[model samples]
Target: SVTLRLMTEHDLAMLYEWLNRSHIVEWWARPTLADVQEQYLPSVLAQESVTPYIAMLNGEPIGYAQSYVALGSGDGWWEEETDPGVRGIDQLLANASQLGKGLGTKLVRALVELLFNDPEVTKIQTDPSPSNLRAIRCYEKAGFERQGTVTTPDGPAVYMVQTRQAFERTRS
Candidate 1:
């Protein structure tokens, strides 16, 4: 079974190790230890708009994920919309050993269910690197539907979305 716990400073070292792993950094962007300390640490400390979590499988940490309210994220991608019910998520498994084991799908499904449990949230979305077919397929298996591509400072991304209704339909 998979569970999520809020990331704490105690998790910094492990998170840094995972971030630097070639399999993870390859698609999630390479961040030096200093970078994680300076950027990621403060975000978690302040409990900013984005809330980060560690994905745990039977009590062992396997990956990381974060959920953010899309309205004021300053990305402007979803800023034009009037809806205030959209949430965004980004995640990656810790290493190649865990790949192809259905953990990615389970992680996403768990987070999606958590987010949708909030009656105020109508949808959840993720934007994976356009070229990351493996990640895209995992998101699809988690019930997200393609919503086209969008350009960010990092380049093009494959945007996808899943609504509370859609997720419920799958459970039925």
Candidate 2:
């Protein structure tokens, strides 16, 4: 079975390798290893707000997931006028070999459950590219709703959100 755990410095080198892969670089267009070492790494490691983790399966690292406030209030890509308690998640299946094994969905769902454990969190949001229909379907199956289309500097993205209420409603 797959499991998720908090990322530690011991995993940094491996995580760094994964981040620079051609597949991951295509989706996450920012922060090179030097950028991560100089800027992103320190922030992600800090206990201030951002939470980062690595997904493990039977003791091996398979992927990574991160959840943080979107805007300054912590809801970045989400609508600025929405709830301040909302959060946005960014995930990647660094290992292309793991594709189609359901690991991606499992990692996302696990991360969502962890984020919702915080009482202050009202909703969780994700914006996958419109061309990535497989990911969109995965989020939908994980209980996310298609809010609409959103465009980022990178290009067109599909905005999706999952509320605590919506998740509960779908469960029963």
Candidate 3:
């Protein structure tokens, strides 16, 4: 039963540990603890537009997910997106032993439900590194569809999206 909790200042240490795991660092980066603090603190305080969450399986932290407005996120992210209702997301599963176990899909299913809970959130978007096959699989399994490749601040990415109608089809 994977569930998501709103990330707080109290979760920063846990996030730092997860972010540096070897599996995570493969596709993600090796961020200093200081970098994690500086980047996430604003979101935790509601000062930033992004909303962060911690995924838990039976009360154990399994990963992290973040959502932000895509239309105006800047930094070369979704600059051409026209809808304010479009939101984007990023996530990682921390436990190395959990790879290929379907938990990543479960975690993202929860994330999708949360992000789409608001009527204003008309679509959910995600961009994974084109080479990260595991991530592309997870997002696909969780209900997103490939919209092709795009370059981001991080480099080339395979853009995926889940429209409200698409997500709705999965629920009922």
Per-candidate local distance difference test: 0.84, 0.75, 0.86
lDDT of 2 by residue, 59-149 (tens): 8788887777764332233345456677778777878888878888888888888888888888998888988888898888778889888
- True-structure RMSD, every candidate: 1.9, 2.8, 1.5
Per-prediction TM-score: 0.91, 0.83, 0.94
lDDT of 3 by residue, 65-127 (tens): 888888767667677889999988888888999889999999899989988898899999999
- Which 10-residue window of candidate 2 scores lowest in summed lDDT? 72-81
Candidate whose lDDT is highest: 3
Residue 70 C-alpha lDDT in model 3: 80
The regions of model 2 sitting more than 4 angstroms off are 30-32, 42-49, 73-79
Q: lDDT score of model 3?
A: 0.86
- How close to the true structure is residue 78 of candidate 1, measured as C-alpha lDDT? 61
* Inter-residue clash pairs, candidate 3: none
